[PDB]
């Protein structure tokens, strides 16, 4: 009963295109589509997430003429050392009396700061992203709404017709297979995997999930001796590689990605770039379609030029006088690929006339339109 | 609000200072423990030994601060408070050992307060403070108009958390003012408080006090005391010895001023003129604060290139077939085509 | 939650071997120091033996000195003792305790959980 | 070789009176004192360590202190419930703890 009717769209956004639809036995007809959003949507994988550390440092245990044991603890990154020799004072003068034997015993560790909650990058495996596409589809003078993933076996449909949209000619994403997301930017670099971070660079500390009790951290934490009788934990540590990272971001995919493709988050999704094309297959139903002796007949026709110009715009003005002794609809074709005509169809009543805007590279401008059932031919004299 | 008693049972401390003014480090009142910026908006929140907006009775009082003073809290004006950069700082509010304030451009951080004997007591830390910029333009002071983006603030909020701070006993405290030399003899004077002592005097000298003491037939210098038994409790800072292996803790204090993402607002450079050529585009480019400038090609190889514009700049950049897109600011990018 | 279970005792005969056991919970076992301490019927607390965590350190009273062994397993986070060569002097009750640090030698702890002793009684 | 001792057997108070139990050693062992509460049937239970420190649980009425060598466990108010032998320990900076012979607080009557 239906005709499948296939067309191919280059993968822009706000650009209209005319699809002609010409079933044998038929009238043909123009079908006037436009493709308002190009959407293409990673599948992500936490691996972890990087924040700043806190260095955490209790007091430290001093004793008096004695031997401080260090413990082994659990903590990301614990440090733990025992200095002897030392003789600490306090402001009201020293602390131990005996200094025979003083032991001071430092400890530290490394914790999720408080901002790791807030402020901090998740590092995702990004793969098998999934496209999808918004069309505007206009069919005698109804414009509605047809969204479908373009991978060449889904469709949906609107008013009874069946939109197939996809395979894509090209499976390219602005994504690396490894991303880094902060805030409203995404990043493609290649973090070191969990378990395995580096030093004042980005996964420094890491957790698989922001409430997760199970933190990894290396950040070179040494313990130093006590400053000659000064009371205190000095250490020699590694700069914060979230910090780090911060400043040396550069710009994001947002600013950086090819295609011009728009970066966003939540979710990570790449909008509207001219990757490839989406082919698109109609399922048109069979009654869409009618005879040209079913078509009204218009007489009294004509076309004239009163100005054309030389710009990038469409400058030129053509305008077509018709007349019909009966209300009703036609659709209209140019017959050359030269000149465009912006409406797919028209609506016909009484004494009239349609204006069509036109543009030309040739100070001599001729084509043909065919209105209806008739076709009348345009000239013009452009001028720069 | 008056509702917090974390710091109910607890007391301000001395701690080390590596500078006191004119360069010379001491044991401070208002030391610093450290700083934390994890703010976006530049403001910062400060921990210090003492603790504002609490009196010495234990009291609920936001125009007074208290501070340890050879033993005894000692209440001090809040008003006399100050913080400061390369310039005097702005503080947002307090609470306790917690100052956030929003400081200038500096490399140092000094925190400082009058005392109940009218003598300026300060702290002065080293401290790259350089904030962040929020969007792609700079700025002096925040527009009445602009652009809305997210960033982290410090959040003017006093409610419990779950970040919290140990409070332990303190550690005996060593006072060599407690002892003096009367003929032969060393005389420990407790002034009500509980002392530690110990010698290298012949006989049981070794011992605590809690009355006035004489050791007989030494001198002061071979004696040793300490302040003991302290019944308020103190946060365990590094810069206070422990008492005990595993420490001694008796409660904790959470910490007020929680970190949040919020709405922040940043001016828009003025649009530019523009002007085209042949697959050019032409920009007059007249920004009142610096503004960054970025561009893309809309085709396979973006050519990404970025600048910091000053004043009066033009810039021209060649405009492929498939479009240019230029980023000017906090402005919405402009896209351009050949004509 | 936190508390400590003794085990074993009973009665032998002077010259013969006794093994007690205290079992821990509510708490990490093998972060702390931990204790024997025995109460003979109408005496006070004596204090028998101890082990400081990961049995880096162990001391015995004099009395039992060469008669007594102490070892703690932290996988199964329980203390023992293996008394050899009972005499009718070491008929008590023997208490396990926690101590408040992980080294033997701090002296600002005490033992701040106890557990139910177990009685040991020694005589022909 | 050193050995703790405490008042010489029992002190007989009443409910709402004030006791005060003194243990010494006959050498100095250490800086610090603990003290236990043992009731009849009951495990020991610890009272202060550190000399001055209150273990958690532990109500206000009780209160660790000294004078020279010898410290001293009060009890600020007697309750029904302080009715208890007490004993106080010393470690030696060592595992090798040892404890006082025990003073008993017997009701007044």
């Known amino acids: 009963g239906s005709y499948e009717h296939v067309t191919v769209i280059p993968n822009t956004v706000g650009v209209p295109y005319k699809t002609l639809v010409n079933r044998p036995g038929y009238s043909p007809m123009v079908l006037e589509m436009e493709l308002l959003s190009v959407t293409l949507e990673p599948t992500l994988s936490l691996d972890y997430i990087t924040c700043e550390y806190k260095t955490v440092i209790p007091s430290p245990y001093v004793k008096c003429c004695g031997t401080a044991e260090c413990k082994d603890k659990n903590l990301p990154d614990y440090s733990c050392k025992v200095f002897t020799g030392v003789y600490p004072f306090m402001w009201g003068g020293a602390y131990c009396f005996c200094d025979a034997e003083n032991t001071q015993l430092s400890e530290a560790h490394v914790e999720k700061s408080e901002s790791c909650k807030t402020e901090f990058a998740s590092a995702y495996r990004a793969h098998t992203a999934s496209a999808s596409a918004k069309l505007r589809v206009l069919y005698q003078g109804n414009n509605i709404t047809v969204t479908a993933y373009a991978n060449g076996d889904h469709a949906v449909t609107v008013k009874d017709a069946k939109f197939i949209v996809g395979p894509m000619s090209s499976a390219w994403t602005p994504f690396d297979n490894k991303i880094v997301v902060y805030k409203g930017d995404v990043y493609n670099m290649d973090y070191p995997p969990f378990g395995a971070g580096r030093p004042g660079q980005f996964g420094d500390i890491q957790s698989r999930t922001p409430e997760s009790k199970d933190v990894y951290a290396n950040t070179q934490l040494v313990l130093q001796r006590p400053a000659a009788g000064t009371v205190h934990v000095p250490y020699s540590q590694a700069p914060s590689g979230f910090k780090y990272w911060l400043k040396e971001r550069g710009a994001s995919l947002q600013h950086t990605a090819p295609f011009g493709c728009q970066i966003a988050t939540n979710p990570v999704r790449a909008v509207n770039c001219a990757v490839g094309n989406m082919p698109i297959s109609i399922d048109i139903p069979e009654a869409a379609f009618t005879r040209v002796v079913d078509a009204p007949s218009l007489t009294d026709m004509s076309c004239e030029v009163p100005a054309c110009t030389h710009s990038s715009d469409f400058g030129g003005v053509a305008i077509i006088k018709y007349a019909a002794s009966k209300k009703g609809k036609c659709a209209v074709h140019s017959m050359t690929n030269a000149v465009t005509i912006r409406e797919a169809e028209i609506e016909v009543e009484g004494n009239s006339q349609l204006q069509i805007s036109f543009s030309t590279a040739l100070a001599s401008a001729e084509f043909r339109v065919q209105v209806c059932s008739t076709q009348v031919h345009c000239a013009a004299e452009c001028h720069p | 609000k008056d509702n917090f008693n974390v710091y109910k049972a607890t007391r301000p401390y001395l701690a080390h200072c590596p500078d006191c003014g004119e360069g010379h480090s001491c044991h401070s009142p208002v030391a610093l423990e450290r700083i934390r910026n994890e703010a976006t908006d530049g403001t910062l929140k400060i921990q210090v030994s003492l603790q504002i907006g609490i009196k010495t009775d234990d009291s609920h009082d936001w125009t007074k601060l208290r501070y340890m003073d050879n033993h005894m809290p000692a209440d001090a004006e809040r008003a006399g408070l100050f913080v400061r950069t390369s310039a005097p700082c702005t503080i947002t509010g307090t609470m306790g050992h917690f100052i956030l304030a929003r400081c200038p451009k500096g490399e140092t951080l000094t925190v400082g307060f009058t005392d109940s004997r009218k003598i300026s007591h300060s702290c002065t830390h080293p401290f790259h403070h350089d904030p962040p910029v929020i969007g792609r333009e700079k700025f002096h002071s925040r527009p009445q108009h602009g652009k809305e983006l997210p960033c982290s603030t410090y959040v003017q909020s006093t409610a419990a958390t779950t970040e919290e701070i140990e409070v332990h006993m303190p550690p005996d405290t060593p006072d060599r003012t407690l002892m003096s030399q009367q003929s032969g003899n060393v005389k420990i004077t407790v002034n009500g408080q509980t002392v530690r002592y110990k010698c290298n005097c012949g006989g049981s000298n070794e011992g605590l006090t809690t009355t006035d003491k004489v050791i007989n037939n030494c001198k002061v210098d071979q004696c040793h005391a300490a302040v003991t038994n302290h019944k308020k409790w103190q946060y365990n800072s590094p810069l206070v010895p422990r008492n005990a292996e595993l420490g001694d803790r008796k409660g904790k204090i959470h910490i007020p001023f929680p970190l949040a993402n919020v709405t922040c607002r940043v001016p828009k450079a003025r649009n530019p003129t523009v002007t085209y050529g042949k697959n050019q585009v032409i920009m007059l480019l007249y920004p009142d604060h610096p503004t960054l400038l970025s561009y893309r090609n809309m085709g396979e190889e973006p050519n990404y290139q970025e600048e910091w514009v000053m004043h009066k700049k033009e810039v021209v950049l060649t405009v492929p077939t498939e479009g240019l897109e230029v980023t000017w600011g906090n402005n919405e990018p402009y896209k351009y085509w050949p004509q | 939650e936190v508390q400590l279970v003794e085990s074993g005792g009973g009665l032998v005969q002077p010259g013969r071997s006794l093994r007690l056991s205290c079992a821990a919970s509510?708490?990490?076992?093998?972060?702390?120091?931990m204790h024997w301490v025995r109460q003979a019927p109408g005496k006070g607390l004596e204090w028998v033996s101890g082990?400081?965590?990961?049995?880096?350190?162990?001391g015995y009273a004099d009395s039992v000195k060469g008669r007594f062994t102490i070892s703690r397993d932290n996988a199964k986070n329980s203390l023992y003792l293996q008394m050899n060569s009972l005499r009718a002097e070491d008929t008590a009750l023997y208490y396990c305790?926690?101590?408040?640090?992980?080294?033997?030698?701090?002296?600002?702890?005490?033992?701040?959980?106890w557990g139910q002793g177990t009685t040991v009684t020694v005589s022909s | 070789d050193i050995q703790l001792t405490q008042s010489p057997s029992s002190l007989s108070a009443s409910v709402g009176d004030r006791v005060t139990i003194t243990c010494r050693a006959s050498?100095?062992?250490?800086?610090?004192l603990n003290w236990y509460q043992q009731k009849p049937g009951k495990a020991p239970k610890l009272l202060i360590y550190?000399?001055?420190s209150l273990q958690s649980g532990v109500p206000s009425r009780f209160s660790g202190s000294g004078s020279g060598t010898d410290f001293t466990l009060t009890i600020s108010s007697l309750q029904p419930e302080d009715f208890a032998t007490y004993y106080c320990?010393?470690?030696?900076?060592?595992?090798?703890?040892?404890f006082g012979q025990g003073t008993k607080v017997e009701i007044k009557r």
């Open positions: 305790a926690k101590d408040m640090g992980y080294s033997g030698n701090d002296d600002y702890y005490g033992m701040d959980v």
């Open positions: 050498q100095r062992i250490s800086s610090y």
């Open positions: 550190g000399a001055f």
């Open positions: 320990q010393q470690s030696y900076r060592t595992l090798t703890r040892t």
């Open positions: 509510g708490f990490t076992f093998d972060d702390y120091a």
């Open positions: 082990i400081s965590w990961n049995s880096g350190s162990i």
